[model samples]
Target chain A: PSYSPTSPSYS
Target chain B: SAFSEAALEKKLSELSNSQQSVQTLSLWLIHHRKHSRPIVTVWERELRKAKPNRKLTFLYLANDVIQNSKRKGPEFTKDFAPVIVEAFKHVSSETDESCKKHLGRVLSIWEERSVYENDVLEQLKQALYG
Candidate 1:
């Protein structure tokens, strides 16, 4: 669930 | 999430690694289209100031995208099409003295192939078709 678009690690 | 994401496979698979998938995603993100603006801004601010490091940074970003696309597929022609168009446009519009510099930076990402001119011209036709 660590896939937010704003997350540095997400992109 | 399921509703909006249905039929759109988020996972990267062998089928999704094809040219069609790459083109779709690359165009969706406006990679080539956006590169024009990015290069213009970087060139104006950094190249104008004679900052080779800043220019190199921009080149690195372009190269990284090219490398990532290459790793995902054997042939990068589809991805490189948009990329070459952006590079060609930048080269054509910039000052004559700066053209070689920009070309050098672009060549760091992909070889200067004869097909790039054809690809750039094709993209121009598509953009002006309206």
Candidate 2:
């Protein structure tokens, strides 16, 4: 549920 | 999908860039049957850039395709093919392998996400008629 900026995951 | 997105010079990014404006400009020009002129303009702009322009082009194209559909009829299939073809031609011309690969990936993402389906229908209904 947290955003992962480096991984290109949901933000 | 291709050239003019290129020339206005150097590395392409997903964020910023007046890509949508360029696409609208392209479509407006193309719809007016100024294909060659539009392509030329795009090529000139793109070539000035230091990186691939198609990623931004694709993003803009996809956004326009989806957004335009909400107000009008579905013309994405008609409008998009030429753009993609144009991009392919540019990729060939530049011999930028990365552009081709990125384009393929973009195409796949567009194919998978840019359709009107049940979920979209529901969302539209909720957003507009609810």
Clashes of each: 0, 17
Deviation in Å, model 2, residue B17 alpha carbon: 3.7
TM-score for candidate 2, residues paired by index: 0.35
Give the fraction of native contacts in model 2.
0.00
How much is B20 displaced in model 2, in angstroms? 7.6
Residue lDDT tens for model 2, B1-130: 4444343222223323354444544354344332444434454345334255444453444444334343344454344434444444444455455545544454444445554444443443332223
lDDT of 2 at A5: 13
Off by over 4 Å in 2: A1-11, B1-63, B66-71, B114-130
Could you give the CAPRI-style class of model 2? Answer: incorrect
For model 1 chain B, where is the 10-residue window of minimal lDDT? B6-15
lDDT tens per residue, model 1, B1-130: 2211211223111113234444443433233333434433432333334333233333333334444444344244354454544544443444354544544544422333232345454663343231
Model 2 local distance difference test score: 0.40
Could you tell me the interface RMSD of model 1?
Answer: 13.2
Each candidate's DockQ:
0.03, 0.05
